[PDB]
Amino acid sequence: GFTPPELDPNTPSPIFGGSTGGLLRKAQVEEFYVITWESPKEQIFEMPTGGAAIMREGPNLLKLARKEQCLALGTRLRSKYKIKYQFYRVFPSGEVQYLHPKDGVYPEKVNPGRQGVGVNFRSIGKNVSPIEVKFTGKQPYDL
Amino acid sequence: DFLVHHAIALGLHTTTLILVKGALDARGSKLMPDKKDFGYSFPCDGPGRGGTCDISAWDAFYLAVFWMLNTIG
Amino acid sequence: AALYTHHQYIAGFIMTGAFAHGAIFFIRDYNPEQNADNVLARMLEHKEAIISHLSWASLFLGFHTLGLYVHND
Amino acid sequence: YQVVQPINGDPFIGSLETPVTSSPLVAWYLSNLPGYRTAVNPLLRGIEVGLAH
Amino acid sequence: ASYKVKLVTPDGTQEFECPSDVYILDHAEEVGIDLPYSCRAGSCSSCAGKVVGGEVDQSDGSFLDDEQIEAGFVLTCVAYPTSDVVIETHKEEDLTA
Amino acid sequence: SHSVKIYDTCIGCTQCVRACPTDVLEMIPWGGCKAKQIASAPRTEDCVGCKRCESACPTDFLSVRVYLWHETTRSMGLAY
Amino acid sequence: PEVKILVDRDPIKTSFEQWAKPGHFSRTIAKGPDTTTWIWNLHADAHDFDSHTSDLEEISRKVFSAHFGQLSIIFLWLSGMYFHGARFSNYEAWLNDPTHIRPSAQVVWPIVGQEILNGDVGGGFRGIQITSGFFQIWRASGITSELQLYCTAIGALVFAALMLFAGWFHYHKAAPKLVWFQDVESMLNHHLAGLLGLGSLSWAGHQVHVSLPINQFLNAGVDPKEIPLPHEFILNRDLLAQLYPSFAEGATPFFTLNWSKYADFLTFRGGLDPLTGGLWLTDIAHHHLAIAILFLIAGHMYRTNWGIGHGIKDILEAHKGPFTGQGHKGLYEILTTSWHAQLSINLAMLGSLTIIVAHHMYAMPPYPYLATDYGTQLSLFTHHMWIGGFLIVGAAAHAAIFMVRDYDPTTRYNDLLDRVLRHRDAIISHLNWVCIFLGFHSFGLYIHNDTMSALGRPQDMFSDTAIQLQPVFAQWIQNTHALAPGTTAPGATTSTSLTWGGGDLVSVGGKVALLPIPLGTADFLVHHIHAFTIHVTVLILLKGVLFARSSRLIPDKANLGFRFPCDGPGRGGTCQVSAWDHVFLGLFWMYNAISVVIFHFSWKMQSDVWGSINDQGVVTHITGGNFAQSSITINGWLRDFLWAQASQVIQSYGSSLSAYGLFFLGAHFVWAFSLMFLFSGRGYWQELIESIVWAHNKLKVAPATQPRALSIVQGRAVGVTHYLLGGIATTWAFFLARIIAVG
Amino acid sequence: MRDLKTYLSVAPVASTLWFAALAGLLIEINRFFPDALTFPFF
Amino acid sequence: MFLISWRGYWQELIETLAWAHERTPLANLIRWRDKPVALSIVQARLVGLVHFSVGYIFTYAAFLIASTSGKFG
Numbered sequence A: 001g002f003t004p005p006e007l008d009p010n011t012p013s014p015i016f017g018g019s020t021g022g023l024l025r026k027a028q029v030e031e032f033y034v035i036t037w038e039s040p041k042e043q044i045f046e047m048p049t050g051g052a053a054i055m056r057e058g059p060n061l062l063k064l065a066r067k068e069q070c071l072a073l074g075t076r077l078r079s080k081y082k083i084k085y086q087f088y089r090v091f092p093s094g095e096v097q098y099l100h101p102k103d104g105v106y107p108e109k110v111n112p113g114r115q116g117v118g119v120n121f122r123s124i125g126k127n128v129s130p131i132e133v134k135f136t137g138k139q140p141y142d143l
Numbered sequence B: 001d002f003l004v005h006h007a008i009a010l011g012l013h014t015t016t017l018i019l020v021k022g023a024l025d026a027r028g029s030k031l032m033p034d035k036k037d038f039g040y041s042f043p044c045d046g047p048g049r050g051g052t053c054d055i056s057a058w059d060a061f062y063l064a065v066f067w068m069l070n071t072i073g
Numbered sequence C: 001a002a003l004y005t006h007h008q009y010i011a012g013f014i015m016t017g018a019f020a021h022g023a024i025f026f027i028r029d030y031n032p033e034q035n036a037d038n039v040l041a042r043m044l045e046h047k048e049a050i051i052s053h054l055s056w057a058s059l060f061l062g063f064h065t066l067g068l069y070v071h072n073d
Numbered sequence D: 001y002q003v004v005q006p007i008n009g010d011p012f013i014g015s016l017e018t019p020v021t022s023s024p025l026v027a028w029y030l031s032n033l034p035g036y037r038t039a040v041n042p043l044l045r046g047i048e049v050g051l052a053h
Numbered sequence E: 001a002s003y004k005v006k007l008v009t010p011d012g013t014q015e016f017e018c019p020s021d022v023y024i025l026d027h028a029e030e031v032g033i034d035l036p037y038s039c040r041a042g043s044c045s046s047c048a049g050k051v052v053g054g055e056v057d058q059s060d061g062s063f064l065d066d067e068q069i070e071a072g073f074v075l076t077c078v079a080y081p082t083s084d085v086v087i088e089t090h091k092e093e094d095l096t097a
Numbered sequence F: 001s002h003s004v005k006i007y008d009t010c011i012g013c014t015q016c017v018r019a020c021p022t023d024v025l026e027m028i029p030w031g032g033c034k035a036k037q038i039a040s041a042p043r044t045e046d047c048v049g050c051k052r053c054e055s056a057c058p059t060d061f062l063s064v065r066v067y068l069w070h071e072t073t074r075s076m077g078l079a080y
Numbered sequence G: 001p002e003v004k005i006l007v008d009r010d011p012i013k014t015s016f017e018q019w020a021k022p023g024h025f026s027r028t029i030a031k032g033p034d035t036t037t038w039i040w041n042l043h044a045d046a047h048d049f050d051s052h053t054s055d056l057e058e059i060s061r062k063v064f065s066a067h068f069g070q071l072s073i074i075f076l077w078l079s080g081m082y083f084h085g086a087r088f089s090n091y092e093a094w095l096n097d098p099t100h101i102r103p104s105a106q107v108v109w110p111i112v113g114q115e116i117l118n119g120d121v122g123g124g125f126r127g128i129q130i131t132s133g134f135f136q137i138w139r140a141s142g143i144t145s146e147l148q149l150y151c152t153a154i155g156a157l158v159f160a161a162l163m164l165f166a167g168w169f170h171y172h173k174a175a176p177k178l179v180w181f182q183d184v185e186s187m188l189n190h191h192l193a194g195l196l197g198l199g200s201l202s203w204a205g206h207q208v209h210v211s212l213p214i215n216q217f218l219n220a221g222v223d224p225k226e227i228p229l230p231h232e233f234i235l236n237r238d239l240l241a242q243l244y245p246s247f248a249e250g251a252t253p254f255f256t257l258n259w260s261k262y263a264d265f266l267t268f269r270g271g272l273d274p275l276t277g278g279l280w281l282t283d284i285a286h287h288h289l290a291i292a293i294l295f296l297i298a299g300h301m302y303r304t305n306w307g308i309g310h311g312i313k314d315i316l317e318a319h320k321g322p323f324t325g326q327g328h329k330g331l332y333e334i335l336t337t338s339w340h341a342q343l344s345i346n347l348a349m350l351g352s353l354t355i356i357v358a359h360h361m362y363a364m365p366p367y368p369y370l371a372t373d374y375g376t377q378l379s380l381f382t383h384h385m386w387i388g389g390f391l392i393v394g395a396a397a398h399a400a401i402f403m404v405r406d407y408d409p410t411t412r413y414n415d416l417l418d419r420v421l422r423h424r425d426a427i428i429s430h431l432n433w434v435c436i437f438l439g440f441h442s443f444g445l446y447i448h449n450d451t452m453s454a455l456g457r458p459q460d461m462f463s464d465t466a467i468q469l470q471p472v473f474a475q476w477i478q479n480t481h482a483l484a485p486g487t488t489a490p491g492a493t494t495s496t497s498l499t500w501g502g503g504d505l506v507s508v509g510g511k512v513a514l515l516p517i518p519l520g521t522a523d524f525l526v527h528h529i530h531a532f533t534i535h536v537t538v539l540i541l542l543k544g545v546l547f548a549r550s551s552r553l554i555p556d557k558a559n560l561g562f563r564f565p566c567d568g569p570g571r572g573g574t575c576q577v578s579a580w581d582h583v584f585l586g587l588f589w590m591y592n593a594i595s596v597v598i599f600h601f602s603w604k605m606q607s608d609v610w611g612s613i614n615d616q617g618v619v620t621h622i623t624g625g626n627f628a629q630s631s632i633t634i635n636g637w638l639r640d641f642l643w644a645q646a647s648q649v650i651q652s653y654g655s656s657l658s659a660y661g662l663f664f665l666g667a668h669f670v671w672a673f674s675l676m677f678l679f680s681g682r683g684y685w686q687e688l689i690e691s692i693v694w695a696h697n698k699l700k701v702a703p704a705t706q707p708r709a710l711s712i713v714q715g716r717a718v719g720v721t722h723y724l725l726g727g728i729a730t731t732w733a734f735f736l737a738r739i740i741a742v743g
Numbered sequence H: 001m002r003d004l005k006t007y008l009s010v011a012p013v014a015s016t017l018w019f020a021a022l023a024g025l026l027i028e029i030n031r032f033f034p035d036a037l038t039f040p041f042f
Numbered sequence I: 001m002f003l004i005s006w007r008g009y010w011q012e013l014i015e016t017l018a019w020a021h022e023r024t025p026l027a028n029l030i031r032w033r034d035k036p037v038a039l040s041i042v043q044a045r046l047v048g049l050v051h052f053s054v055g056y057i058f059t060y061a062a063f064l065i066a067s068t069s070g071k072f073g
């Protein structure tokens, strides 16, 4: 069921000159993200944190401090260029966790192997009044 | 005295307009029909549907305190 | 002078609080079906008339009080 | 020839290497301060620091 | 007025009658050659097509690139067929790129 | 963690999914509409509370709702 | 490669088709409107040409003809000024006696009792005293009759017509194409040498033949109607030979290179004319001559068609070093394909220039009878300060627009821009620290002084008598300037100004034109306040520019566009995270900075320079040196400056200065009114308009264009514009009423 | 001409002409019957 | 300030301040324990309202008591 690709260190990363928008202490102590793509040729692309970098012909692996920054770079790579990307989340443990695209197909394309999470079978106008859930820990929408 | 008493009347009416509008619109309006399940005080409902800055009832109170200060002034 | 101003400012803050807690009630503790068609629900259901007329009264007072003051000036 | 380099050559850590940040004498000086005397008992570093302050 | 509308489609190519004041997609449903749709309000790619001949009114358009209007693409749900135009169906992704 | 809910008025347009910055939403099979699709929110622990998804919902009222809730460092979008 | 005129014939046919259609340029607008928001958008994007299309050629053609339209408007304004000076003025009476008659070139019609504004300005005339300083310009140009003013007004009218026609022509009949605009070498060659070089040479030619002799005659005391007409000075030359003997040789000195034989009317005196209180005209003529020579040579630097010259690309890409990589390589391609880059550069430079102009004009008064016309001086300084500030803020606005819309490292890559984008965080952090430090050590000194004075401890205060903070550098510099003439500028007799020193007070008609300005502790404090405010507004604007494309907060800020409300209340709340919002603040801080600057100027001038001279040489100033001791605490500003100076405007009612009192109060009102837009949000207003719409619908009187509350950005725009209008207008009324009553 | 008639009836121009006419009327009225605090005819 | 300037501006300023603190010698030896964040939206509206009203009350009380106390009549 779509064994996710395993992160391959020794994959080169784009030619960058350095920036003050890179990683910080949060990447040291809690987590950071890593995105990979494959680059038909060596080109210039705008970095989601600073200026411009040069993606190498062949595997490109970039480490960002925010998942949102990764998805932004992924969107730019995917529609301005035509490049398929995947990103992971790395903990200070040395664990990696394949993040996107979760089940091999982009989420804008329906896949028959996904379950419904957080779906309510009613229209939004049929939530109970807050008075109905007073003094119980539940929220009227979580129902 | 006449002119300033009518200034007072305007102050009272506008403050009560703000507060009553905040109270009667607390459970929801046409711009946000499901306001009641968001609580009494919240930021806004994002920039969609034209923008919903200061849509709480807390925001109505917040706006009415200015008019209260002005009228008591 | 101090006593008068003190008590008037305190009264203004108290009035604003009364209306704020009216709104908080309407959000948190109001039950529509238990209040079916009584005075509270019927207040809620013609809120547009109340708000529009409060706005008319305040517009009239403001327009004319400011206009008379500016004419005199 | 270029003077400003990424930190330790890693261009994805949020900092740079410049003259004020990383030139020989300024590195030696900063390292020779009680605060950055890592292998020294903390009490004596506190003494030196406290006396100067 | 009611100019004939031609639509290439994986089902084939059919001809239907519909007045210039109405969307091609709306009268298509009245005849019965099924087409895709979702929002029905001109703000999505679902009902996308492109044209072979003629051109449709771009007045009923929104949420489109400042080019999708003149590069060929169009929305069946929000479009008035000013002539005997020939259009494509099931054209979302080669529009989605 | 903010809480995102999807209601059955969803027409499965998928504009909201294509709008979210953090890949919280998804498209899943269904049978209640003509697209046989509906939006799911399996990863709300990454939701920043941006509510771009609500501005992309063409239904009235909305079919995708974001209720801001307890904040995390993921929820606050903090890089430090 | 070579440069030529390249045109297109009849690109757009003049027609009334699109006038009937509202927002033809915007596809969405053209169709029509569903709500009230459509009307606001129509105006907000009328002149944003680079978004109506994507063709650079069309953008630049539109820009060219819009410039023509603006020039026409300016000419119409000038002709109106000249005509009002010709017909509804007391310019001739003022010309007979300058330092008793008050200049005024506007009368009002007696409709509702407003004729009280027709005050006694002297000269058998009743009108509204003007502060434009136009009378001084006309006197310095040699204009003695109102026939000359009439001729000038009509000439400017036909020039406005010509400009309007040229605007129509260069857009609808003969519109240039892109390669014509993208030629900047020849454009610079012509603007340096042709517009500024020939312009200033032509003006020096005017002053040599018209202003010099006519002003000589006027200063000799001749009745203005007994003066020869200017053309006589050209026909009969011995008329000039009498005033200026070395007009006898007549241009043979210019070719023998015996230029010293011209030392008569081409001087290097410096200082002021003790009779008129302005600069020597024989100095201004020499100045413009030298300026002309300099610009005429300078407009020959860039290569256009004949090999000689400089390629701007070569000059740019020759400059690079070890700190900046390949700097300046690729800027020529950036500055010739994006109008916003050029616009922001030019706006920054023009604002800087306007403020330099204000300073130099207050310090070295160029026009006769200008220095002792205190109202004109104050108004000119204040007006130019405001204009400069606004332009400088617009510079930042358009730098941000460039960064968002036109910056592209894929096709147009520059190194320096990239490096600054790469260490923007260090830049902004250090600017932040400087703002904080400067704010603590300038305003904190004022707070310390206020509490030291309120605790009955004046010895502990930061003042001239307790704890001196003397600006030793400024004092040293101005003493160096005072000693300059004869020591290190041997060809000058007087120092370039009288604020430097040397004594030599100059007065005119019993009023003080100029005297040495002393710098004490209060000057130190207020100068550091100035530095602080400038640094903070620079911080806001630079932070807006550097972080316009992306940040650590929202990673794709450019996709949201240059101007937008927010991206939801996520990540904690992203209210005003856009570049446009940064410009909105900068305007607030620019207002603060310029306000403090003009207050400083006005108080210091009314306290240490202006005033009335007397028979012994005893100078009583407007305020007896109350700036040196009272300006060091905020209570002094509130009491001695605002409360004291404010009394003039409050008592204006019942006199001819009543309009200033009215504008004082009205500006207070509109300023307070702005706060309704600046403190609230559009959600409350949409919800209120909902019930108002209900009230209308109940009576079949609801409109079809659905009324919406303003956009979030529009509400901020209405709030900031009203705020600025209110504040600037109340300061305007206060200044004018005060300086016209006490001046 | 037809289009000029149209443009001259667009909202801003229609309203400026209307308000200029109204201003002229009120100005002349108060120029003939000035300083009027009441209605003194009947 | 809290009423005109909004959260986004301040949040980004705070984040660059955080960078600056983490990057400097002799002071990165000290670490905060809560990540500094700009005030909330509702929190900022509250703080601004509190400042506004406190300033209001204090300046008017000063003026009233000083102007009546000065003349004592």
Ligand code: CLA
Binding pocket: B010, B014, B017, B018, B063, B066, B067, C055, C056, C058, C059, C060, C061, C062, C063, C066, G669, G672, G673, G674, G675, G676, G677, G679, G680
């Ligand atoms: C001096 C500042 C000021 C002024 C004049 C107003 C005025 C007004 N406020 Mg407001 N308000 C203010 C400050 C101010 N507010 C502040 C600081 C806040 C806190 C944020 C609020 C919050 C607030 C709220 C929440 C509400 C109001 C409302 C109102 C309206 C009340 C109705 C009325 O009185 O009739 C009119 C009074 C006037 C003073 C209007 C006079 C302006 C005249 C018409 C100008 C005439 C134009 C003239 C022909 C020339 C124009 C110039 C030209 C360039 C166009 C009124 C227009 C209430 C409302 O909407 O009423 C329904 C409302 O709900 N205010």
Ligand code: CLA
Binding pocket: G072, G073, G076, G106, G107, G108, G109, G110, G111, G112, G114, G117, G128, G164, G658, G659, G662, G663, H027
């Ligand atoms: C009930 C109150 C009231 C009324 C009815 C009036 C009425 C009047 N006032 Mg008054 N005023 C009032 C109160 C009032 N005022 C108060 C309270 C004050 C104290 C602040 C004043 C102070 C005041 C002053 C100082 C003046 C007036 C003037 C006037 C008169 C003309 C105003 C004018 O013509 O504008 C301006 C008209 C023009 C500028 C004409 C221009 C025509 C248009 C705009 C031309 C546009 C076309 C152009 C070609 C476009 C360019 C395009 C280009 C590219 C081709 C008018 C009868 C003026 C006057 O008396 O005239 C001498 C005047 O000077 N008032």
Ligand code: CLA
Binding pocket: G064, G067, G068, G069, G071, G180, G186, G187, G190, G191, G193, G194, G195
């Ligand atoms: C000696 C030649 C010369 C002169 C005097 C000027 C003068 C001027 N240029 Mg221009 N320009 C020139 C050559 C020249 N240019 C060349 C060679 C190019 C490139 C091919 C350009 C391209 C250019 C552009 C793109 C723009 C200007 C602009 C301007 C105006 C700037 C605004 C100003 O300062 O107002 C000062 C006002 C005056 C000096 C009033 C006098 C106006 C006189 C009559 C102008 C006549 C000079 C003109 C070149 C005559 C040739 C046309 C002829 C066939 C009739 C100004 C009038 C700006 C503009 O167009 O404004 C509308 C602007 O956008 N110029």
Ligand code: CLA
Binding pocket: G043, G044, G045, G046, G047, G048, G049, G347, G390, G391, G392, G393, G394, G395, G397, G401, G563, G580, G583, G587, G721
């Ligand atoms: C040579 C100077 C210059 C030029 C050519 C431009 C040109 C442009 N600017 Mg700009 N700007 C400038 C200076 C300049 N600016 C300065 C000095 C500032 C600082 C304030 C700004 C700040 C600025 C901002 C913030 C923005 C622009 C924008 C724009 C673009 C669209 C403008 C527009 O159509 O809006 C329409 C014009 C109006 C709606 C006019 C508004 C009326 C004003 C606010 C009232 C003025 C009151 C008046 C003086 C007195 C009161 C009158 C009343 C009482 C009757 C356009 C290309 C906009 C853009 O998006 O760029 C792409 C944008 O948002 N500019």
Ligand code: CLA
Binding pocket: G438, G470, G471, G472, G473, G474, G475, G519, G523, G524, G527, G528, G530, G531, G532
């Ligand atoms: C750093 C903020 C700052 C700023 C923006 C200004 C700005 C200004 N000063 Mg000033 N000044 C400053 C600090 C500053 N000063 C300090 C710290 C002192 C010593 C107490 C002075 C003493 C001073 C005098 C005596 C005079 C001025 C004057 C002036 C004005 C003319 C320019 C000038 O002569 O400056 C000159 C500034 C300097 C020579 C010192 C600059 C600071 C240097 C570059 C190092 C920065 C110090 C830093 C804060 C501490 C060390 C860094 C640390 C991290 C290791 C001008 C507006 C003149 C004036 O008042 O005009 C009317 C005047 O005569 N200043």
Ligand SMILES: CC1=C(/C=C/C(C)=C/C=C/C(C)=C/C=C/C=C(C)/C=C/C=C(C)/C=C/C2=C(C)CCCC2(C)C)C(C)(C)CCC1
Binding pocket: B023, C018, C019, C021, C022, C023, C025, C026
């Ligand atoms: C005896 C006498 C008389 C009479 C009098 C009278 C008749 C009285 C009165 C009065 C009145 C008549 C008063 C009142 C007031 C009121 C108010 C002030 C109100 C209020 C309300 C509120 C505030 C509300 C709240 C709320 C809400 C909002 C909603 C929910 C519910 C609640 C309730 C919570 C006279 C003088 C003639 C003569 C002498 C003797």
Ligand code: SF4
Binding pocket: B043, B044, B045, B046, B047, B051, B052, B053, B054, G565, G566, G567, G568, G569, G570, G573, G574, G575, G576, G681, G712, I041
């Ligand atoms: S700008 Fe308004 S709508 Fe947007 S996040 Fe802030 S309060 Fe909410």
Ligand code: SF4
Binding pocket: F004, F019, F020, F021, F022, F024, F025, F046, F047, F048, F049, F050, F051, F052, F053, F054, F066, G570
């Ligand atoms: S709040 Fe933002 S991140 Fe969360 S689901 Fe909506 S658009 Fe996506």
Ligand code: FES
Binding pocket: E036, E037, E038, E039, E040, E041, E042, E043, E044, E045, E046, E047, E048, E075, E076, E077, E078
């Ligand atoms: S079905 Fe969405 S635009 Fe047609």
